[model samples]
Target: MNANLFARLFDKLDDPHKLAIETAAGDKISYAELVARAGRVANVLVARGLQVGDRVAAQTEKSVEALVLYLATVRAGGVYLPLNTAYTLHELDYFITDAEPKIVVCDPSKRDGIAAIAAKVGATVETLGPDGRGSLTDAAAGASEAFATIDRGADDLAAILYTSGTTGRSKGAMLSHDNLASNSLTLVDYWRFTPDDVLIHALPIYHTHGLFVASNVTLFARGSMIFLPKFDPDKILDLMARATVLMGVPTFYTRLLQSPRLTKETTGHMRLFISGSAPLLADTHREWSAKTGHAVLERYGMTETNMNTSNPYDGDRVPGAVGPALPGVSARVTDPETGKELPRGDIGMIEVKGPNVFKGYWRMPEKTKSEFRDDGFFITGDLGKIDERGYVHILGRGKDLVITGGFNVYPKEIESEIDAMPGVVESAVIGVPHADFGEGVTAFVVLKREFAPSEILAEELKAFVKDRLAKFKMPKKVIFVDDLPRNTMGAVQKNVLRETYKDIYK
Candidate 1:
């Protein structure tokens, strides 16, 4: 039996002795060792009755062994489902129940709780920990280092990534081997990756960015990765000489920028830096490029699609835009109400169609249908526009639209203007319930370190915006705070903001 994805990754390895992964502490796993470890775990999985088409859910911390477990699932022809490590028992219950996997792999510390949840769904629980010691490893210890690979096809489901349910129930987006394979192949060329490259892997494995785009691309290129468990500025900087690329969230850049060691000399040896998962502030983007002489290639993507757009590897790396639709992917903007295409420079709903798009939301045919247009384009729910040069500029989420005094307001438009103010570091614009305006435009700001929020400063800033924006677009209130609430991935949790200020305007 042959696996479509796993076989593609391991079969073409010209040199199995070549290094595949290296930890921060200098521990390395070569491609040959990676395959043997994955084979052992695959045999363990097969012994537990896991088979082709079965779901294997994982909720473990980042580790080389955990990645091996994922590869083993693919080798065994099982669908992989990775859960966020920060999720609670309550949250895990929902996912475990929804996915209904054959086995749920989690940290040893949470094995009891996850086992209880998995038992109810007639699924087994396996433990894998950060230190590489767990029940799964114990079972694999006695298993063979080689197993017959299971046969799978391009259309076979590879993974099920759940969306962030800010609106309602989290829908698992089903991705196929074809989807992952095609995207990885496309990106390998688009990003100009070569076997000579080395990636500094610090992002979480549960997300598409880390698992599919970064990991798969590296595998296809036969490149090595410095697989540190998490983002540690010191370790990451220390390893730059050994790395050619670094793909990370915007927070990674922000934190790195804060360090005095982040200068041209420190990053002179690095080739490329990529940012995604959240919008990168123009301030941070400019700072990064000025300090290192390389712009962070910002890309647009989500659970439904591994990647949609990316700044060109060889061209202008725009500060505020995720560049044109990637090679082989088509992107268009449309009027939200009419569902008709919008002209360039008009901010509207962004839709995309490509091989990279997921099959659909698992077990929610109706919801899935609603997300796609009659013509095959998937409504991204993100509001953005295309520039004359074809770059895509994302404003904000459609659900983040603010209807204040019966007029439409895009938060990013206002936030952008506010962020350019003298004392403002960053800003988030939200809509809150209002007795008069139905929904009021509210702004939360993070001021420069030396700035203080006071009635005088508030009024001055309000006046400052009043001069720049139309009266209707001006924020109804400007509230300064230490920082905005963010998810683990660095996206502002505006739902929390809306909840906090819901009563204020009411």
Candidate 2:
């Protein structure tokens, strides 16, 4: 395998004439056409002065052309960095400055704004539109399609994905060719994908789930994908009959469950339904399993680690557990305070060690070293425990733990109990500033259709939690809400909740 991630992936693909990515509109591109497109994009990058290991940052809308651009960067030996589409100029500025990319690709509409900031870092900016017509595409139009895949070692950097930066400055996780390749190789076999499979890909390419998990796994399995720009419940349902597999966030299943069309008959042709990026609620898991007669196989991973733990394709896909470690990956529960491994059933910070783990954070040696232990286990900031049967249960992020008067309160536990309550659709438990407890346990809940917000309703829910949990674990204040704020991937935005109620006790 060539050190180049794209070239190595190419070796596992089917004939160049086989269909690779097919759009929802029936537009198709073969493996061969993809190679040619990627080649031309590679030539464009080279002609534009991109060199080996140079950062090629892209914030453009998702399109076949944009994916080709990513392959092109890898083919040209440049590190690909895809930014979130919704990132503000302020956010983009930090990335462009921190990474100091040689070339920055953005939407045509934001070319001028991105260019202004990219200029300060001496980086050239290009535009890529949804229709794939922009300065980048224009440059690739006439460029030679004969590209020599750059030789790279397994340890050679392939991409840099920045963290969500909810707590502090975002750190770019450096993913090597080996890191991506090894994980995909393990997943394909574990998940039982093949050339006959068709993946309904609606996740954002800027993230690991869509790009590495969905797309890379499809490529490695020599399968094709019904490439849709975003998740539309109606469109997804309409297409599910024709597709074999679908990978989505928890929101996808929730929204699909809302539709009357989601039945075992609609998904009868499908083999597997995978969920990741955020915790898929146990309720969603059970509901999807009941509706479609297919238990949504939920897995867990992070920007720092590609696919750490995955619920088995053959075994009991346990509700509320993210399953055991993936093949070639070792996962353990470690005490965050002592960095010592915890026994089974003991909740602690989840730690993982594997080839799938990222090389390190870009240009942050101290931060990188601090995250890993002497034995090479990278300390995942997530808190969890392993059951007796070896199922990994994710509690919540370490930062999400609510400390109420010196007692550690896991929000997921409180939220889970609240969610199972009558008339409650969902709940978010957040720690807010408190005059007495230092940090008070607060809960925001969404009720059923007929239940309106009222103090009486809140009291009942409080009494419900107080009965189930310890007094310190109980929510001090329960506020009824219509919905919880979430990010693009459907993870509850507790930081938003924290900010909204920062002064609740002030």
Candidate 3:
């Protein structure tokens, strides 16, 4: 059976004249036009000698034509690799050298520099800008819009996504056709998506949340999307009237809450608001529901897995808990030291086995072997617990655990207490080297705009959590910062925090 993901998405586009995408600039592209444009681009890829299973790396601004390039690559049986556009030329060199894609599609402004990098790996270069005018599209203008979809198996590669390398060099997670298809189909059912749903697409396509989950689920359900170039609070608020769903990171909600225009009357027509890619604070969830009358559903996923667990659409959407595992997926917590399954409600490494899991890391057999268990479960490297209620509580990454003096400290536990303080907005806890103890627990905090940082306030914060936490988990030093270091996805960069305060305790 042919298992191309694009074929499944294309089949659902039964109506030729239905709107597929409405761009931020008020440009509309119908389903028929999108399919024809994708066909033209697919012919361009074939004309350039793209072969089955060959990689097509793209690092260009988000545009309707950029989205078409993704469909074209998949339709032509090539593996798609979307790189973060924020990457510098030095970083781009590493990815181009490692992936060795048959063709590299980049922004028009970077064509000369990218051409130099592609030449070293025997790869050709093509440019596609935000306006969708480049050599790539110029060639596609005259190509035929009648290319046949390539045949592929369920296990054939579909894409390769690179993890954010906070600790070490980034590795590419290889996703198969079944991996993307299964996860997206499940989400379409779980989220109650339909052809009537219209999504506000503001997240970047380079990440799984946008490319696979948002784009694939919308396609499977035959829904339309209001695609924005980036997250703009004013634009999103204005478009909420026409959109039924809005999926974003924690920062999106926080920013919207800051706007005076965010009221129930403004969002009365909205159906759902989903948050992911970072931990959503319970406070933010509560405030958003209070203001907009819509509970934000938070889900858990990573580069290797498209999505494993999500809060139910019908049931009680609890704050701070990513709901039960989805259908056909198994999740369990295991002791990090012995790999033994931990009892319910006990924090340990979260392991999962499912069709959603990626095949393996690209060109790294040894690394792949070490990440999976003998029973086919992949170790997530995240410390979390399944409660008696069957909800998963993510503590944090295992590497972020603080070993102060001889005791292990979970930073989430301490951060939760500090965040609830009267004046504190948020806090990040990290372990820094110490002269006496092996490591010292340090906290970087952000306070409300009206509150000023003072030595007395830091001491008060330590005292506020003293009764709730063990003495070892308490912060030895508290430093005030304007903001926490975060990636594009809104995940706090603990590695950056560690490096910045590495010598504080000394």
Model 2, global lDDT: 0.90
Q: Per-residue CA lDDT of candidate 2, range 196-249, in tens?
A: 899999998888898889988998888899888888988888888889999999
Clashes of each: 0, 1, 0
Ranking by lDDT: 3, 2, 1
| lDDT by residue (tens digit), candidate 3, 1-506 | 56998887785556878888998788898888998999999999988879999999999999888889988999999999999999998999998888999999999999998899999988878899998899999989999999889998888999998997765677899999999999999999999999899999999998999888988998888889999999999999998888899999999999999999999999999999999988998899999988988999999998998899999998878898888988888899999999999999999999999999999999999999999999999999899999987888898998898887889999988999999899888999998898877889898999999999999988898888889988788888999999999988778898898888898876
Q: Is candidate 1 or candidate 3 better by TM-score?
A: 3
> Lowest-lDDT window of 10 residues in candidate 3?
7-16
Where model 2 places Cα greater than 4 Å from the true spot, the runs are 11-14
Stretches of candidate 1 off by over 4 Å are: 1-3, 166-168
- lDDT per residue for candidate 1 within 1-506, as digits (tens), equals 34478887886678998888987668988999999999999998888889788899999989888889888998888899999889999999989888889988999999888888999889988899988789999999999997767777777898998876665567899998888988989889989899889999998888889888889999888888998888899989988877899999888998998899888888988889999988987778999988888889999998998899999999998988999999889999999989999989998999999989999998889988899999999999999999999999998888999998979998887998888789998889998988999998999999998898987888888888877788999988889989999877677889988888788865
Higher-scoring candidate on lDDT, 2 or 3: 3
TM-score, one value per model: 0.97, 0.98, 0.98
For model 3, the superposed segments whose C-alpha errors exceed 4 Å read none
